[PDB]
Amino acid sequence: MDMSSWWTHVEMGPPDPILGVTEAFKRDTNSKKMNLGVGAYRDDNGKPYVLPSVRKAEAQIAAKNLDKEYLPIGGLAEFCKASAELALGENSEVLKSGRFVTVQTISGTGALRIGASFLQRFFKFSRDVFLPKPTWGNHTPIFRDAGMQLQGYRYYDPKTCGFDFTGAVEDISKIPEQSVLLLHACAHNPTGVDPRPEQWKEIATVVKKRNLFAFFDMAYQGFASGDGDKDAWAVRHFIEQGINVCLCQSYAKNMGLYGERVGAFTMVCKDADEAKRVESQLKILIRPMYSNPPLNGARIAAAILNTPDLRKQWLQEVKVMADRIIGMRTQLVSNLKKEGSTHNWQHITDQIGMFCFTGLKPEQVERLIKEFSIYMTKDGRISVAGVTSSNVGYLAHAIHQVTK
Amino acid sequence: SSWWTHVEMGPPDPILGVTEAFKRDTNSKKMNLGVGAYRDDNGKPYVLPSVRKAEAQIAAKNLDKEYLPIGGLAEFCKASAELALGENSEVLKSGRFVTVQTISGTGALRIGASFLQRFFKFSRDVFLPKPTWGNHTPIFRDAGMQLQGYRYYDPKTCGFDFTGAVEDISKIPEQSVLLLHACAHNPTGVDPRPEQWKEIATVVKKRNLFAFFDMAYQGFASGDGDKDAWAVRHFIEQGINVCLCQSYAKNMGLYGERVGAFTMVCKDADEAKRVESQLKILIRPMYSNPPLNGARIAAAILNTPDLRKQWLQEVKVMADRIIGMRTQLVSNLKKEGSTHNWQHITDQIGMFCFTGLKPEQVERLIKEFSIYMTKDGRISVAGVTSSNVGYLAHAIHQVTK
Ligand SMILES: [Cl-]
Numbered sequence: 001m002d003m004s005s006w007w008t009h010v011e012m013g014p015p016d017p018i019l020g021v022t023e024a025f026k027r028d029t030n031s032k033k034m035n036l037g038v039g040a041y042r043d044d045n046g047k048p049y050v051l052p053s054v055r056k057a058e059a060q061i062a063a064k065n066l067d068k069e070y071l072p073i074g075g076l077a078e079f080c081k082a083s084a085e086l087a088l089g090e091n092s093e094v095l096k097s098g099r100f101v102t103v104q105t106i107s108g109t110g111a112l113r114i115g116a117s118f119l120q121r122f123f124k125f126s127r128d129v130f131l132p133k134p135t136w137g138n139h140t141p142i143f144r145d146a147g148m149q150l151q152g153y154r155y156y157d158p159k160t161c162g163f164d165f166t167g168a169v170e171d172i173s174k175i176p177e178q179s180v181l182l183l184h185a186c187a188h189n190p191t192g193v194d195p196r197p198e199q200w201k202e203i204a205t206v207v208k209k210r211n212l213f214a215f216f217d218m219a220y221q222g223f224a225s226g227d228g229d230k231d232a233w234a235v236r237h238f239i240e241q242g243i244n245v246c247l248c249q250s251y252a253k254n255m256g257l258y259g260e261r262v263g264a265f266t267m268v269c270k271d272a273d274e275a276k277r278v279e280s281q282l283k284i285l286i287r288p289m290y291s292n293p294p295l296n297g298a299r300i301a302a303a304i305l306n307t308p309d310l311r312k313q314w315l316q317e318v319k320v321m322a323d324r325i326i327g328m329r330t331q332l333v334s335n336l337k338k339e340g341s342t343h344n345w346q347h348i349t350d351q352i353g354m355f356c357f358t359g360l361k362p363e364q365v366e367r368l369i370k371e372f373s374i375y376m377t378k379d380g381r382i383s384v385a386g387v388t389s390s391n392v393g394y395l396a397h398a399i400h401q402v403t404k
Numbered sequence: 405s406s407w408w409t410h411v412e413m414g415p416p417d418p419i420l421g422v423t424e425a426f427k428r429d430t431n432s433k434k435m436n437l438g439v440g441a442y443r444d445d446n447g448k449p450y451v452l453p454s455v456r457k458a459e460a461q462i463a464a465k466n467l468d469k470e471y472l473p474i475g476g477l478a479e480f481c482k483a484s485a486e487l488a489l490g491e492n493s494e495v496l497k498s499g500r501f502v503t504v505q506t507i508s509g510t511g512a513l514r515i516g517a518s519f520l521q522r523f524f525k526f527s528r529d530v531f532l533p534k535p536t537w538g539n540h541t542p543i544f545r546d547a548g549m550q551l552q553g554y555r556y557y558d559p560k561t562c563g564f565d566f567t568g569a570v571e572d573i574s575k576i577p578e579q580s581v582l583l584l585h586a587c588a589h590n591p592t593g594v595d596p597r598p599e600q601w602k603e604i605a606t607v608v609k610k611r612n613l614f615a616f617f618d619m620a621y622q623g624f625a626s627g628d629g630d631k632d633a634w635a636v637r638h639f640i641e642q643g644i645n646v647c648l649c650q651s652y653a654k655n656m657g658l659y660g661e662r663v664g665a666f667t668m669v670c671k672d673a674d675e676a677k678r679v680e681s682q683l684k685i686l687i688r689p690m691y692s693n694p695p696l697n698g699a700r701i702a703a704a705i706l707n708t709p710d711l712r713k714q715w716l717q718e719v720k721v722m723a724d725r726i727i728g729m730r731t732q733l734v735s736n737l738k739k740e741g742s743t744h745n746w747q748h749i750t751d752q753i754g755m756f757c758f759t760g761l762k763p764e765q766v767e768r769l770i771k772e773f774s775i776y777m778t779k780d781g782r783i784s785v786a787g788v789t790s791s792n793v794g795y796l797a798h799a800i801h802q803v804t805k
Binding site: 005006007008009010011012013039040048050054058062067068069070071106107109110113122123124138141142144145213244252256257258259260261267269270274276277278280281283284285287288289290291292293294295296297 | 406407408409410411412413414440441449451455459463468469470471472507508510511514523524525526539542543545546547614645653657658659660661662668670671675677678679681682684685686688689690691692693694695696697698
């Protein structure tokens with residue numbers, strides 16, 4: 001008898017490495033264990049953190065007794081406008097001229113995917129999307145599933161645990177004209193290594209000269225440094241130089257709306273007419289993917305952005321979150337010197353965001369797990385969110401022991 | 405030059421165009437029979453009381469907003485499978501299924517289509533009913549499949565072309581994909597009767613077709629969730645390992661929360677595990693993980709006995725409102741003196757009705773009475789209320805007499 005089914009030939013997918021680390025962490029019986037693979041912000045008690053401004057926004061919304069009817073294909077208009085304003089800045093000529101289209105998406109991933117699908121259909125010049133080495137794990141399958149091809153450019157420098165400026169500029173200067181270049185706006189995931197403003201300026205010059213299309217992923221505006229204007233400076237600089245970028249925004253981190261799935265995709269265009277045509281085709285792409293986006297998170301974000309008192313309170317809360325992460329970076333470096341480490345750990349404080357490439361080797365990572373129950377990925381990436389005032393001393397001691 | 409000089413403006417949306425034209429009309433007696441969502445008897449959006457209670461239950465728990473798994477909220481997925489398959493389903497007992505949370509029904513359709521594209525080595529063809537939901541074609545086309553058609557609606561009876569459907573399905577190449585609306589066919593409202601479903605199942609099984617069910621109206625269609633899901637359950641009983649796209653947009657009124665689920669019925673639990681792994685691999689690069697608000701609500705309703713009972717009552721009232729408007733339209737048409745057969749209006753199921761009105765009659769209804777509907781004669785029964793059903797019947801009588 002032929003006992004075949006439809007899916008006999010469907011193989012079991014490979015294990016997710018990051019998930020494996022957190023799963024291993026959960027099983028560990030050591031009371032001193034640390035999870036430096038956690039992929040979301042945690043407070044100084046190591047707990048999930050709902051922003052008070054978000055709670056207050058929820059109360060504002062709940063009192064209005066709103067319906068749950070479908071949003072437009074491109075989402076909540078109020079949210080889209082406010083999202084664009086956050087990214088581009090109040091003084092933006094792009095906003096004043098209306099030479100842009102912003103559509104609400106299923107968080108940052110949704111924005112990346114919609115952007116990729118738009119490129120597949122309309123960016124006829126090339127299929128190649130250049131990603132930094134390394135980049136977010138999901139970037140490759142997003143573009144690949146969308147029907148694009150992936151290339152790489154040097155970014156992280158293993159020798160310094162910093163930015164390979166020379167290597168990056170060299171690689172970008174050799175990217176075929178009219179190719180897509182993906183850039184992390186700030187808080188590079190997973191290294192935390194960001195170009196300095198003067199380095200950004202040089203990159204922009206090459207992008208403009210070689211007629212590259214700049215695709216910005218901005219998942220950490222405000223969360224990175226505590227200053228939303230500073231964090232979005234590179235994006236705004238490119239636009240000022242006449243580079244009509246696209247932009248993927250997430251509110252997962254900076255508003256802690258992880259599971260609500262709140263994001264936006266923006267295309268900066270030549271003029272309002274071009275934006276209208278791009279908008280129509282974006283909607284044509286969105287509708288057969290999920291028809292229209294979720295309401296709850298967009299209402300919360302819109303309420304925060306468009307209510308002055310809430311916006312101010314939110315920006316305060318974001319700064320405190322950014323400062324906690326900066327503080328843990330600073331305390332780790334300080335404690336490492338206290339422990340008597342002679343290794344250069346300046347990269348830990350030079351990096352930005354909740355992900356840090358430590359430079360730890362796989363063998364050292366393995367020892368940290370076995371001996372100290374400190375869990376991180378084999379690449380030596382740590383989630384700074386997993387570090388608190390209570391365990392930063394323990395972490396520094398452990399890192400010293402495995403590197404001394 | 406610019407990057408997007410060659411990007412052209414998209415074509416006008418016919419459905420939206422009807423609503424837009426309706427909005428502009430200055431006639432105080434105007435009716436929008438193109439509305440694509442439930443409305444109460446006052447023509448207003450309707451949030452279910454059970455949903456409000458669920459929200460209150462959830463708000464009190466002070467829950468976080470952390471990422472769900474790729475496949476969504478586990479308790480929602482399990483409850484959703486149970487709703488579709490029935491509590492005593494052998495599929496549940498054997499565990500030979502995978503259910504993942506999706507971005508409502510559209511999300512489920514697209515995930516299903518993407519799964520077919522990647523793993524359904526047996527065919528590229530997806531057979532849609534004539535007619536079907538407008539979004540079906542682009543979902544499968546964008547996903548990388550080919551579309552075909554089978555006869556479904558009979559314009560001569562405004563009913564189900566059983567003979568034509570069975571004929572067409574019997575000639576579908578073996579191991580093709582067949583899309584079926586579980587109940588409340590959109591846009592016609594014409595459904596196979598149980599006995600007709602049985603013969604369709606026999607042909608599907610004989611021709612070794614893959615049955616892809618779209619179920620957006622369980623409970624909403626007839627007020628009886630078990631009746632509405634009967635065809636899906638029958639196919640499974642007959643050894644057809646279907647997939648299923650569920651939406652909670654209509655039956656819980658969770659439209660904009662985007663609450664849905666995709667279920668694959670599998671040979672065994674092992675197969676389900678492999679399919680699950682690949683579903684997650686497809687989901688993650690689309691949107692990473694699904695929204696938590698609506699799933700928590702649906703889960704709370706389904707898993708709280710009191711809320712579930714109240715919800716099912718509310719669903720019945722909504723279904724009965726639509727049935728009531730169909731009945732009253734036909735009755736009023738009779739009283740107006742119409743000699744035409746309007747039995748199809750009460751035979752059809754769901755909030756969409758193919759009236760059989762010709763394009764010329766549709767135009768007159770717009771011009772003379774400001775009653776707005778699509779040129780195919782489809783009306784949204786949700787646009788009909790106690791206050792306007794008399795006006796509608798008079799108008800239809802005038803244009804058809
Ligand atoms: Cl344990």
